[PDB]
């Protein structure tokens, strides 16, 4: 499960907001869907040319190949930040994210998505997922505060993921 990273991301966009237990399952489902989609698409890219490696740029092209492209912009912007900020220098920490780089890369390779990956590829992918996770939790947490509630309920989640131009694409 990825539930710890979601909660940790929720604490950053909204320090004093909680989340119902199946609203969280909903968040775990979203993470795994969006991970499967991007990581499969970079897998195909990798074998579209006959490159063995899924690298940051296969992820990036997958990103611009899946997200609505104002959203993709911020996502690729976020994944590029995590990469350059990881080079300058731990592991996850150097990338300045809460979604574990090591665990994301371990999910990538137990999916056999390609031959091998750059160590800069799970950082990019954890950055992207952390960003969309933070967007969903950000807006939802806001609609909760707008309605005077301390917890993200599942129905708030869905009226937020729908009822938003880009996020409804996902």
UniProtKB/Swiss-Prot annotation:
Originating organism: Homo sapiens (Human)
Protein name: Histone H2B type 2-E
Chain positions with Omega-N-methylarginine modification: 51, 57
UniProt keyword Secreted present: no
Function: Core component of nucleosome. Nucleosomes wrap and compact DNA into chromatin, limiting DNA accessibility to the cellular machineries which require DNA as a template. Histones thereby play a central role in transcription regulation, DNA repair, DNA replication and chromosomal stability. DNA accessibility is regulated via a complex set of post-translational modifications of histones, also called histone code, and nucleosome remodeling.
Residues annotated with Phosphoserine modification: 1
N6-(beta-hydroxybutyryl)lysine found at: 50, 81, 85
BP GO terms, sorted: antibacterial humoral response; antimicrobial humoral immune response mediated by antimicrobial peptide; defense response to Gram-positive bacterium; innate immune response in mucosa; nucleosome assembly
GO molecular function: DNA binding; protein heterodimerization activity; structural constituent of chromatin
Post-translational modification: Similarly, monoubiquitination at Lys-85 (H2BK120Ub) by the RNF20/40 complex gives a specific tag for epigenetic transcriptional activation and is also prerequisite for histone H3 'Lys-4' and 'Lys-79' methylation. It also functions cooperatively with the FACT dimer to stimulate elongation by RNA polymerase II. Phosphorylation at Ser-1 (H2BS36ph) by AMPK in response to stress promotes transcription.
Residues with N6-succinyllysine modification: 81, 85
Full protein stretch here: 37 to 125 of 126
Modification sites for N6-methyllysine: 11, 73
């Amino acid at each position: 499960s990825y539930s710890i990273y979601v909660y940790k991301v929720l604490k950053q966009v909204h320090p004093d907001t909680g989340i119902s237990s199946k609203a969280m399952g909903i968040m775990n489902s979203f993470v795994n869907d969006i991970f499967e989609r991007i990581a499969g698409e970079a897998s195909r890219l990798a074998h579209y040319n006959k490159r063995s490696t899924i690298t940051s740029r296969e992820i990036q092209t997958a990103v611009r190949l899946l997200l609505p492209g104002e959203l993709a912009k911020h996502a690729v912007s976020e994944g590029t930040k995590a990469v350059t900020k990881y080079t300058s220098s731990s592991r996850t920490v150097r990338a300045e994210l809460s979604f574990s780089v090591s665990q994301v890369e371990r999910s990538l390779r137990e999916g056999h998505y390609a031959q091998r990956l750059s160590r800069t590829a799970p950082v990019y992918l954890a950055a992207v997922i952390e960003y969309l996770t933070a967007k969903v939790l950000e807006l939802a947490g806001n609609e909760a505060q707008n309605s005077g509630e301390r917890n993200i309920t599942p129905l708030l989640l869905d009226m937020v993921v729908h009822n938003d131009r880009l996020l409804s694409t996902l």
